[PDB]
């Protein structure tokens, strides 16, 4: 399913992930299209920072959902 | 374990991965001079209670707290 990652600069990134993908996997995919190390980035959704352990299904990320990227 | 505390200045603290909130406010008082009874630590949008520990709120390495 295609999701979105709205950076903190207005830019919106389109990712293709499965509901069974962990956050570490998502951050890995973001690195491929931005070159940003997973350890330099944090993901916020529904008003909560995503743990690198859980998956998308755990945080209940559906199709066409949009995460926000906040560099650290 | 090393952590941070945003007062506008910032202080670096060396504590244990499971140190209680009470033990932290004790160290902050030694470095800043602020009485524990007059300092509130905020993290993850939720205020830390002196009854719990750091491991509870998942205070990882180089985490950043806030004094209010």
């Amino acid at each position: 399913m295609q999701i979105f990652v709205k950076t903190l600069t207005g830019k919106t990134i389109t990712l293709e992930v499965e509901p069974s993908d962990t956050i570490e996997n998502v951050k890995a995919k973001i690195q491929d299209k931005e070159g940003i190390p997973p350890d330099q980035q944090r993901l916020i959704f529904a008003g909560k920072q995503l743990e690198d352990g859980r998956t998308l299904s755990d945080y209940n990320i559906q199709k066409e959902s949009t995460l926000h990227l906040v560099l650290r | 374990m090393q952590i941070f505390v945003k007062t506008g200045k910032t202080i670096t603290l060396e504590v244990e991965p499971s140190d209680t909130i009470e033990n932290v406010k004790a160290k902050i008082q030694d470095k800043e001079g602020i009485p524990p009874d007059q300092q509130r630590l905020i993290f993850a949008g939720k205020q830390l209670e002196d009854g719990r520990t750091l491991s509870d709120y998942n205070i990882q390495k180089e985490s950043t707290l806030h004094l209010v």
Binding site: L8, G47, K48, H68, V70 | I42, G45, H66
Partner: peptide, 30 residues
């Protein structure tokens, strides 16, 4: 006081006692 507010920048649910986003430092009111 107040109630937990969502940082307009990344929707992060911050604490009322704070005036800036805990994740991006973006102010609460603008």
């Amino acid at each position: 006081e107040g109630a937990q507010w969502n940082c307009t920048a990344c929707t992060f649910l911050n604490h009322p006692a704070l005036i800036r986003c805990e994740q991006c430092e973006m102010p609460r009111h603008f």
